[PDB]
Amino acid sequence: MEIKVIKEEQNYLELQIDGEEHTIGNLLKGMLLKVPGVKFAAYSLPHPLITSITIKILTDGSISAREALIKAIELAENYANLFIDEVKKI
């Protein structure tokens, strides 16, 4: 993937990701919504003919938006690893 920043502050981040679609966007939005300190989080797919998404994060300032995104990625990685561990023993 190729990423780029549209608008970044301490409590706001608009991130565009090229080469991604609903699979990662929905997971990241759902993981962000459970990070403490995040006030608003959404993802957008500007055109269905293009494989690109936009992430929009707003926090209260206690945590950075980039830090919240990294925490959400860590949460998703923990879930994926636990799923891999548990599928091997069914």
Partner 1 sequence: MPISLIERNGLRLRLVLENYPLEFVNSIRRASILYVPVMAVDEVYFIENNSPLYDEILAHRLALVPFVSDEALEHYRPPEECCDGCYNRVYLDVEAKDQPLMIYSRDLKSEDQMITPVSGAIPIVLLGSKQKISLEARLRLGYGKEHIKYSPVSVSIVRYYPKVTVLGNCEKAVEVCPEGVFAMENNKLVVKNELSCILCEECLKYCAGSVSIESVENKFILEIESVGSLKPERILIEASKSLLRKLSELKSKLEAGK
Site for partner 1, rule CB under 8 A = 1, 3, 5, 17, 20, 22-24, 26-27, 29-31, 34, 66, 69-70, 73-74, 76-77, 79-84, 86-88, 90
CA dist., res. 63 & res. 58, Å (int): 10
Query: Residue 79's closest CA among 21, 28, 20?
Result: 28
CA dist., res. 22 & res. 6, Å (int): 20
| Residue whose CB is less far from partner 1, 40 or 83 | 83
In the complex, minimum distance from the CB of residue 39 to partner 1, in angstroms, rounded to a whole number: 19
In the complex, minimum distance from the CB of residue 1 to partner 1, in angstroms, rounded to a whole number: 6
Query: For residue 27, how many other CB atoms are within 10 A of its CB?
Result: 17
| Residue whose CB is less far from partner 1, 38 or 69 | 69
CA dist., res. 27 & res. 32, Å (int): 9
| Residue whose CB is less far from partner 1, 20 or 59 | 20
In the complex, minimum distance from the CB of residue 70 to partner 1, in angstroms, rounded to a whole number: 6
Q: What are phi and psi of 62, to 5 degrees?
A: -65, -30
